[PDB]
Amino acid sequence: MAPLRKTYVLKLYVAGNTPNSVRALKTLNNILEKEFKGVYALKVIDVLKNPQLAEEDKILATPTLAKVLPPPVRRIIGDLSNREKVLIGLDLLYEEIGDQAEDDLGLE
């Protein structure tokens, strides 16, 4: 809980959220805090819940920026695009990325 918290956030932009991609997203979320504790941070943006992009938000084609990502990570990114058919694209920015989101209804 230091003063700053700037890290190379890996933003994923998805259309929808099918229970399976949500698993994999949770999966990939640990492959990161695990092998790269501190270096990266996942951040998913569902366009269906948030269509309008914020000035700083940019969506690049998965294929391009993927190759510079960790091996196990690239594999998830691959299922997501070619299988779970939900990954629109992604980006890599050194941003704030603080508190978790997803307006909680208590999700149980």
Say how many residues make up the chain.
108
Which member of 17, 43, 75, 88 binds its own copies (CB under 8 A)? Answer: 88
Which member of 1, 3, 19, 71 binds its own copies (CB under 8 A)? Answer: 71
Contact 36, 2 (CB under 8 A): no
Contact status: 9 vs its own copies (CB under 8 A): no
Q: What is the DSSP string of 70-103?
A: -HHHHHHHHHHHHTS--EEEEEEEEE---S--S-
Query: 34 vs 106, which CB is nearer to its own copies?
Result: 34
Which member of 25, 28, 44, 86 binds its own copies (CB under 8 A)? Answer: 86
Angle between helices 71-82 and 21-35 (to 10 degrees): 170
Site string for its own copies, 24-63 (x = CB under 8 A): -----------xxxxx-------xx--xxxxxxxxxxxxx
Q: How far is residue 108's CA from residue 106's CA, in Å, rounded to a whole number?
A: 5
Amino acid, res. 42: L
List residues near its own copies by CB under 8 A.
6-8, 13-16, 35-39, 47-48, 51-65, 67-68, 70-71, 81-82, 85-89, 92-95
